[PDB]
Structure formats: C-alpha cells, structure tokens
C-alpha cells in the first residue's frame, strides 16, 4: 500500500514508528505536513497539492491531526476520503471527538460511565451549578473551541465560586466535574483498535499533582483491566465512530468513568510500558480494511 501520515513533525516518536512499521511490512509511507497541503474542491477536478505537485496513488491515510488544527486537518482528511483514500479514522469522527461538550453529551446519552458533569459559560446562579454536580470538591475544565486550556481542582465551594467568577466574561466554555479522589491520581489508558483493547497502562501523577499526564511528568506501569473497563473502552470508541482511539478511564467507586476519547493517541508511553508493536497492529488494521 501507499499510506499518507498527516503529521506536522516527522521526527515525533508516533509518526516515526508508524513510518517504520509501514516500511517493515513493504508499504510506501509518506509523511504529509497537514498545513502545507492545499486543495481544489472542484467536483470535476478534485486535487490535493503539496510543495507544488499533486498527491496521487494513495491507498490509505493515518490522520495525526493536532487539536489546534482540527478544522483544517479534517478538511485535508475529508478531501482524501472524497478521492477514495481509506482513512484509519473518519474526518466526521475526529471532528466529533475534538468537540469535548458534544463528546460528553453523546457518551452520556449512550450510557457510558462518566463523572457527574455540568456545562456553563456565563451562569447567573453559580451556587445552583455547583449544587447540580454534587458540590465541592470538583474539577473545573476550561475549553476554547476544540482545545482544553486548563484543569483545576476546587477543594471548597468558595474556590469553585472564585474560578467560575474569574472565567465569566473570559469567553471560555466551562466543564464542572465531580473530583474522583478514590483514583489517587491514577488513570487507565486503553489503546483501542477495531473492537479490541490491544494494550493498556496505568499513569500515576507525581505526589501532590492530581493531573496525571506523562507529558506533565507522571510515571507509567502495567495494569490488568476489568472486563467492564475493556467493554467501556471499546464502546466509547465505537460510539465516537473511531477505529483507533486512546480511551482514558478513572477507577471510581461507581465503576470506570471515561475522561478522554483521543482520535490521535501517543505510542511512546504505551509501547515502552507494554513492549507491544502498536504501530505494527495499526498497519495490520489498514491491510485488513483498506488494502489487498
């Protein structure tokens, strides 16, 4: 197969590994800088041009679209789709998953486990909003369009009141969530490909810091996931319409709660912890669904 990887940086671990795995398996792997692709959307002559030349003869495309460029990245991917190229993940599914408010409302509607969650922008009754989601302690997430800007623990009602008063008139979208203290700063990353969790890991935040990103300097370990976590991860991906997804889960006292469904999950953390050829399994998925 000829496979495009939509990635802004070909030196990134995940992009390098997808290129490496593709070439091991006899495929022509081309990294396309999403923002350097420009296009004619004419129905009688559809084109994707790149550095002065047309892009031709692609069988499949792996979208690695960063959240800051979701609109343009989805336009480039949509164009590949219209030209008959097989997308690892569909444009409509990536766009849906990057709209955090829409994602939560859909997962909720489909009975996926979620933290008790509220939305606000400029609420006139902040105490009512705080009561609705079960009161302090709660987590406040700040959203600007398709990007998370901050995540903040409010231990008291007055701390929640102050953050909400501050952000009112800053023109951000506000998520208010119950604080899952019982998780003890740990979350589960489940790597979903088709109808399977192919790999999982525990991420532990440094003592004190509650936010547990490996990006934010937290440690990772092996984990045996419950049948309920496994099913939740698979269902969350299918509900979002994603074939490949990272699903982040908190172990709460009311079972597994989905925090994140990521259309472009990292490979570094999960591969170094499990030792599994995740890049290879993704290439295999394209062979079975997009190629000979």
């Amino acid at each position: 197969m000829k496979i495009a990887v939509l990635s802004r940086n070909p030196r990134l671990y995940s992009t390098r590994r997808l290129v490496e795995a593709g070439r091991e398996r006899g495929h022509e792997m081309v990294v396309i800088d999403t923002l350097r692709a420009y296009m004619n959307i004419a129905s009688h002559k559809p084109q994707i041009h790149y550095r002065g030349q047309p892009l031709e003869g692609f069988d499949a495309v792996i979208p690695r679209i960063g959240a800051s460029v979701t609109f343009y990245g989805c336009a480039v991917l949509r164009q590949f789709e219209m030209m008959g190229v097989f997308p690892l993940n569909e444009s409509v599914a990536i766009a849906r998953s990057r709209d955090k408010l829409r994602s939560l409302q859909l997962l909720s509607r489909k009975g996926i486990g979620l933290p008790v969650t509220g939305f606000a922008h400029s609420p006139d009754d902040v105490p009512d909003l705080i009561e609705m989601v079960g009161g302090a302690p709660l987590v406040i997430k700040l959203l600007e369009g398709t990007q998370g800007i901050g995540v903040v623990l409010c231990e008291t009602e007055k701390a929640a009141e102050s953050v909400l008063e501050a952000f009112m008139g800053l023109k951000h979208n506000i998520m208010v969530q119950e604080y899952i203290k019982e998780a003890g700063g740990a979350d589960i990353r489940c790597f979903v490909v088709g109808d399977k969790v192919i790999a999982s890991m525990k991420r532990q935040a440094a003592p004190g810091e509650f936010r547990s990103n490996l990006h934010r300097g937290g440690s990772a370990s092996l984990i045996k996931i419950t049948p309920e976590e496994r099913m939740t991860a698979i269902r969350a991906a299918r509900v979002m319409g994603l074939n490949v997804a990272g699903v982040d889960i908190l172990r709460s006292n009311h079972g597994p709660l989905v925090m994140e469904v990521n259309s472009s999950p990292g490979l570094e953390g999960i591969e170094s912890t499990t030792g599994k050829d995740i890049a290879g399994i993704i290439i295999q998925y394209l062979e079975k669904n997009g190629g000979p």
């Binding site: 995940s14 472009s264 999950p265 570094e268």
Partner: peptide
C-alpha cells in the same frame, strides 16, 4: 506534544 495526546 499535541499529535501524541
């Protein structure tokens, strides 16, 4: 960072 979320 952003593409490796």
């Amino acid at each position: 960072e952003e593409e490796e979320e």
